Amino acid sequence: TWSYPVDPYWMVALKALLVVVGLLTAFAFMTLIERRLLARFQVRMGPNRVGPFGLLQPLADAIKSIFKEDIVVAQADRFLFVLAPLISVVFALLAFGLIPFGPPGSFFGYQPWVINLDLGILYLFAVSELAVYGIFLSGWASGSKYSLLGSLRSSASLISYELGLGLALLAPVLLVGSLNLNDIVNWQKEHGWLFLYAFPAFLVYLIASMAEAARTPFDLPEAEQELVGGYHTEYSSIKWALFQMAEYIHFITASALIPTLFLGGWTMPVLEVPYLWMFLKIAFFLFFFIWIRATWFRLRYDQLLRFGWGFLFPLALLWFLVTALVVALDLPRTYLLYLSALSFLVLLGAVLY
Amino acid sequence: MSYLLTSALLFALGVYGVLTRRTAILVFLSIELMLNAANLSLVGFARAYGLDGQVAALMVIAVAAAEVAVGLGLIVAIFRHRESTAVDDLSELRG
Amino acid sequence: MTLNVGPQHPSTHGVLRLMVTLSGEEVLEVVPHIGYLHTGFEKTMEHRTYLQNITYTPRMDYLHSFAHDLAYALAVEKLLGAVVPPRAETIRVILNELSRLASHLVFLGTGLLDLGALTPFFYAFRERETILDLFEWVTGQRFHHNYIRIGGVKEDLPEEFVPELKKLLEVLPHRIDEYE
Amino acid sequence: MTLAILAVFSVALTLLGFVLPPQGVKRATLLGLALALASLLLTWGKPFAFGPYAVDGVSQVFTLLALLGALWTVGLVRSGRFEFYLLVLYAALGMHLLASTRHLLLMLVALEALSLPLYALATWRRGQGLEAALKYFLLGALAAAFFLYGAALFYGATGSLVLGAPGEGPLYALALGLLLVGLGFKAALAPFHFWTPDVYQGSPTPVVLFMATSVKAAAFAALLRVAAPPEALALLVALSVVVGNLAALAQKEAKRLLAYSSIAHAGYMALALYTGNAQALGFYLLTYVLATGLAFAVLSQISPDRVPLEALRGLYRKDPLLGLAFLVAMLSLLGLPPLAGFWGKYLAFAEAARAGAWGVLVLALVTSAVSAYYYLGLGLAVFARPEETPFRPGPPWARAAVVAAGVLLLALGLLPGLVLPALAAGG
Amino acid sequence: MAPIQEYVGTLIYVGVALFIGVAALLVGALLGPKKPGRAKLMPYESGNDPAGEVKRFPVHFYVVAMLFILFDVEVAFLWPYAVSAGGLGLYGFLGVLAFTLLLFVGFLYEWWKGVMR
Amino acid sequence: REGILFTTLEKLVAWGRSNSLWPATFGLACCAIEMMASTDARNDLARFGSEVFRASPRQADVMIVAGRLSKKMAPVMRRVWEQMPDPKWVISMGACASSGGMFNNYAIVQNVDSVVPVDVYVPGCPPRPEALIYAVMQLQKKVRGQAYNERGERLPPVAAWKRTRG
Amino acid sequence: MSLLEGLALFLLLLSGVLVVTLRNAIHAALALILNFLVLAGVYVALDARFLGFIQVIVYAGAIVVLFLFVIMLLFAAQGEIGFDPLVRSRPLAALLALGVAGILAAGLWGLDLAFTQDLKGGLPQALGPLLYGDWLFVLLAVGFLLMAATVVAVALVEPG
Ligand SMILES: COc1oc([C@H]2C/C(=C/C(C)=C/c3ccc([N+](=O)[O-])cc3)CO2)c(C)c(=O)c1C
Ligand code: SF4
């Protein structure tokens, strides 16, 4: 926060409240839109019911979720059973402020974001660990080892790719040299779209975000189709709703961070509108991701672990070494454009054999 | 200065744990608390003497990571087939 | 870990109980427990006339049922010496292979969904839906059709059956090639 | 730049063990350690410092001793696990870094780097070996916490974490005490000695050889850097010697008795700490290392898991050279003329009296005279009647090594004016 | 760098998120039929013993977590070089490369041994 | 609190529970494949709100007895019903479940109202997917209090609310 | 300062009391994570910023997570089995627990210190040239130590 102002604390509290309730509405309507887009994918059509376009169905879902006999299962830990959903929701809500939705004042006067910490990516990493925390804690608390093993699967796999997230996020820092997202986005305004320099690491970031229950390991797991997952299967009225809510908020926050960090956080080269381009890129990644949601299988978390550990992370640290050589000797930055273009051509042309 | 007194108090608390705790895991947790009390004192004295105690505490965290890894591997090796990790069940070696 | 992969849960289609004797992520050995659908065909059929039992036969294998109808029919035809008209035989092989396509569709859709992806369940099922219409054309029923008889089949094919069959037979090869 | 040799050999062999048989990795470790020892020889009198890494007489002497013990104990180890060799290399480097630095935090890193493999090397899988490993690990982590809060309070007394700082009053004393706790723990000083008998008794004999040579050498090498006040030194010496010898009287097992003996000898060595001579102490520890490595190589030829006192007996009839060497070693560990144990004892006692601490010195001497009870129950026992005892009379490797060690003990006892003139800069 | 005001704004962010989550918990818990049953409170799966009596879970998760702690320490050490990189020149670059090669050798060992175990 | 005691809120929560009916499948026999077919891309019960399908019983309100209920499965399914949150409904699908069906013997429960409280009965063999849509709409208006039987009575919103569990 | 300082110290001390008194291993580790959060906040208040972020990331995110992984693999929550209770040591330890504090308090009591240095926040921007440089030797030693730690644990468990 070298150059960025500070709104009063009451504005911070107000905007946080706005972000929380907007994330409610957002995840409800995104569940609707994902249903309908899946429908378009699998021929069938969606709920032209309670809406018309479905836009009163989240209300029915929320009203059903409450009054649903929120039960505390016996043979379960009285404390963690209740405490884990709150953890999973709290440590999911936050870490959305830093994503810049415009230049300062483009919130009709004050601030597009909430907080602009000096060290942002570390804050994101730290609160991202805590989602796995709530997952496996809730698994333990339920008193059902069928969910315990699912929680252990979740935590192991997510933790492997969560380590990989660090080797992914190293690459652009060497270039910019700042850990505040606004400086990084402004760098992406100057030279342009950081992934152009670091496309390989970009990949291993993107794929890493897929491991966080987004889809295609899909061995989080969910109770369905396999050794049942954790953090569910024992929660009835709101705590399950809180798990679904926090997991989807993590989904959409990650799908928004992917363009924010590597690609063009809003900051478009032309037409420079504050919010709309960020929202459209969020929707772009969401639509590609839903394509993936419909179109691909599971990974069984054995090949997933082997792939993350042996394949993603050595490759990411190799790219880190290359970029660190380039930055420390600082000779051009264009060499990185050339190398990333060649790397993408390799990782693409090797497909059509 | 209150922070360094608190570091000493946490050192004492980890000591009370290590003495009182029956299982290896809780003893090791108390030791982690002791090491972090030391880290707090190092951060204070780095604020007083110029920031080298911060990198010192960083290396301390690394040390804790290495010894946590090794201690948990050893614990598994001894008490995987064995019953409760309680060390009072191991009294073969006496003076 | 002698884990109780119970009847119908989790997603053991075709209610079946499993005691997976298993430590870890490997599989030592699975001990099965079945009978959770025992309804009594071998016994109830001893109290139903041969004509009636054609109502009990398809419902055992509810996916590929005309094989059950055909097995029962043929065995009784041999036992009392019945004559298959050529047209009845051709129709019986039509319904046999078509119910086989439907059973196969359901099998692969269930296999893909059971672990992995959800989408290809629908497309195959789409075709299955079309097939059912064909059956509803001649038998008036989706499945569990009581159409076959000891001598042959109940009554004749409608005028509208064959063109729909040609339509589905022309669209299908590309569809199966797509699945593969 | 011998540390470069150690790092290179360790890191290369770490992967090469996947392509090389344990025997090939063993021979490679032997070559690497021998080359590091030779590099130490060619660098005698060539001080070399880069950062906190500072090579002085202590560094050279004690790292030479540690490499000697490592080479010896590798000579005995033939297990089909390359890991059981790699750790040795690792421990070596670690102990090297312990003696070659003045930075307190780098001292902590070296303590961890040398202590981690030593926990695991004692796992012949015997349940008592695991009991010893757990006792060792927990008490060592406690001592690491103590040492760390001592380094923190040291930084509280001065702007640097390097020893040689002027130092304040009570806070500096407290910091130095909290450093001395862990360092003497590594050096088997009482009242921190409880781990030593259990660990020496539970672990396989060659591992205890490696311990009783290199651990004690490196621990005193790190101790000399500390400016320990004489009163705490008197407390440690008195408690160590008294309890060590007394409780060693009542012991029935060879390894446990010898661990108590090592406690008493660490109490004796701590007398040079009155003057911090580092010449006399280098010589003393050279003799003690040689003798104890010899004895434990023989004990390994007798029994890895545990050796009773009767097992030592009749060895001369079994092996002449081994019995002679064990007798000589027992007398040198008693510090008797004309053996080098007597020169080391005399040099430490001279430094202590020169500092003017009289009651402590006399008490150490009276208790060392008391020690003849078991020192003689061991040294002379070589000639007794062999009772039932498993006995594997070794290869020629260890026999020649034992012979050289004993000959050198007696030679440095007779004529110390050969090497002792060169334990300082090394003319 | 960044002012401390953003950090109290962070604390308020957390307090607001926590307060709204506790509010959602209150809404869920207070609104309900409240008819407990013995079988309802039973864990799962048809009579007893969904998993029931099983031996301790596989250690592979311990291996993964330990791997993660050591390599996350690695990443924490790599970050100060990530920010202050050009100021360290080829000397700092070469030092960080050696560090990375050492821990990558540790990975290479654990991989050539592999953990399917 | 049972979704009652307010002229507006009981209508609101009945609206919510009725439209957001989340089925808990218990696939047993050939009725259950006609239950699956009610979700494919020709005739899908994926519109009224039943898109998602909570396999766990702790999360779903509608349990559909879909197939012949063999006696060795009676108690398990019982507990599956007891493993449901209290605001739960049960539809009896098919002839084998509603009555004994054609299998009138020692192996089948001759009316599943024995083990579970049934909301709606739906005949057919198997009842056409469209009859299943009609039954879920029947239950929709039943839990709003918009259901009357042949005898002139309005039916309670939730069956399994009138039974002294034990 | 003191307004929130008292709160942070009370949370730290109460969390320590929890982690050393409670018999539930899970509750103890959880209280230790609450402790680390309070302590990273105190670090932040001490102008040590980067270290607090690593404290939350590494300690809470990684170490105690593995603690929880093992104790959930090996239940171990009901520790009081195979007691040999040794009741007298519970109050006696408190004595020693007081003692190991008192002498420390003596070293720090009557001690005034210069807590005045413009650290400008403990950012890694300034910690880099220290780490690679004056501390590079310790860094390389730490990295090799971590490699040795991996090898030790791997050769240690290695069922075969
Ligand atoms: C699987 O095949 C089969 O099943 C059954 C039972 C089990 C069953 C499960 C699920 C998971 C349905 C389901 C499908 C799709 C969704 N969805 O949301 O898309 C939801 C739920 C339905 O009938 C029987 C009896 C069978 O004999 C065969 C061959
Ligand atoms: S009513 Fe007919 S379709 Fe349904 S389970 Fe019974 S036999 Fe099968």
Author numbering:
A (entry chain H): 2 to 354
B (entry chain K): 1 to 95
C (entry chain 4): 26 to 205
D (entry chain N): 1 to 427
E (entry chain A): 1 to 117
F (entry chain 6): 16 to 181
G (entry chain J): 1 to 160
Paper text:
Complex I (NADH:ubiquinone (UQ) oxidoreductase) is the first and the largest enzyme of the respiratory chain, catalysing the transfer of two electrons from NADH to UQ, coupled to the translocation of four protons across the bacterial or inner mitochondrial membrane. In bacterial complex I the 14 “core” subunits, necessary and sufficient for complex I function, are shared equally between the peripheral and membrane arms, together forming an L-shaped molecule. All known co-factors of complex I reside in the PA: the primary electron acceptor flavin-mononucleotide (FMN) is connected by the redox chain of seven Fe–S clusters to the quinone-binding site (Q-site) at the interface with the membrane domain. In this work we address this question by building and analyzing atomic structures of nine different conformational states of complex I, which were obtained by X-ray crystallography and single-particle cryo-EM.
Aureothin, pyridaben and piericidin A are the most potent inhibitors of T. thermophilus complex I, while rotenone is less effective than it is with mammalian enzyme. All Q-like ligands studied here display a similar pattern of interactions at the deepest end of the Q-cavity, with the headgroup about 12 Å away from cluster N2. A shared feature between all ligands bound in the Q-site is a hydrogen bond interaction of a ketone group from the quinone ring with the conserved and essential for complex I activity Y87416,36. In the case of aureothin, H384 stabilizes its outer ether group, while M516 interacts with the oxygen in the furanose ring. The distal nitrobenzene moiety is surrounded by both charged and nonpolar residues that, despite the lack of direct interaction, might form a suitable pocket for its accommodation. In these structures quinone-like compounds are bound in the main “deep” site within the cavity, where quinone can effectively accept electrons from cluster N2. Most dramatic changes are caused by DQ binding, whilst Q-like inhibitors alter complex I conformation consistently in a similar way but to a lesser degree, to states intermediate between CXIINT and CXIDQ. The overlap analysis (OA) (technique described below) shows that transitions from CXIINT structure to CXIAUT and CXIPYR involve relatively minor PA rotation component (mode 8), which is much stronger for CXIPIE structure and is accompanied in addition by a bending motion (mode 7) for CXIDQ structure.
